[PDB]
């Protein structure tokens, strides 16, 4: 029941909001996973790996160029905003709001969220393979060689770009090859971040799960910790729960959430 949720809402001083792919989906962002989530031949499992990058970096960067570019036309949905404005509203009252997101499209930032933790990184950050420097980057195209590349249709010609023309680290001391600062399959989450999040979750007195369920990664690393403290937890997603039954507001975040946070 919504009323009941809202009563907790008003009381809460430290809200933590975990956000999954559902919320990026509603802004039309592709995730390249499950049926018909394709980019040329591949799904993300195929390309989002250290091995793919080591093996064919041009191809991977093509993939990522595309993703960077299709972002120019996808905007934050109402859920992104309702969150951001919440954070703003409550911050003024000295109540905190933090965002822990597995999404890498920077939509929450563009919505005006501030206290955000991007635990899979971000398409608009690079990491130098040589020196390890992490830098913001929204340039379009990220490098000339990549101009108008990364077409999605299966039959596109590979651009087969020489490594030295792919994006390179601007400290010429170094000039290492840049990769997208994103967590790939088979890599580990930055532990500095996980510690911060642990801390935030420990501190929190109401927890929201949006566009994913507590039952799955990554919500499942934590929701158990917070729940075992007795803190209430609300899911918002397109999922269903069994006739015989934490709160759950089935439906699009875009619709479910803004009323919930007013």
């Amino acid at each position: 029941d919504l009323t009941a949720f809202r009563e907790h809402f008003a009381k809460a001083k430290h809200i933590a909001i975990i956000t999954g792919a559902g919320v990026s989906a509603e802004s039309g962002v592709p995730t390249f996973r499950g049926p018909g989530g394709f980019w040329r031949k591949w799904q993300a499992q195929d390309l989002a790996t250290p091995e793919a990058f080591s093996r064919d970096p041009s191809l991977v960067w093509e993939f990522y160029h595309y993703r960077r570019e299709v972002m120019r036309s996808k905007m934050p949905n109402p859920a992104h905003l309702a969150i951001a404005e919440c954070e703003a509203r409550l911050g003024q009252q000295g109540r905190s709001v933090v965002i822990i997101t597995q999404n890498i499209d920077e939509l929450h930032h563009r919505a005006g969220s501030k206290h955000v933790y991007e635990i899979h990184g971000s398409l608009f950050k690079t990491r130098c393979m040589s020196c390890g420097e992490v830098k913001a980057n929204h340039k379009s195209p990220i490098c000339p060689a990549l101009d108008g590349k990364g077409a999605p249709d299966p039959n596109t010609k590979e651009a087969r770009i020489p490594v030295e023309l792919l994006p390179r680290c601007e400290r010429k001391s170094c000039n290492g090859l840049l990769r997208p600062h994103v967590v790939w399959f088979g890599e580990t989450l930055d532990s500095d971040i996980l510690t911060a999040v642990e801390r935030e979750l420990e501190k929190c007195d109401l927890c929201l799960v949006v566009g994913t369920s507590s039952i799955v990664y990554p919500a499942a690393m934590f929701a158990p910790q917070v729940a075992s403290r007795g803190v209430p937890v609300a899911e918002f997603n397109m999922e269903c729960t069994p006739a015989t039954q934490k709160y759950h507001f089935e439906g699009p975040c875009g619709s479910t959430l803004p009323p919930a946070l007013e």
Binding site: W184, F185, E187, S191
Partner: peptide
């Protein structure tokens, strides 16, 4: 370090 989606 925690594996993205636990390595499933």
């Amino acid at each position: 370090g925690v594996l993205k989606e636990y390595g499933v």
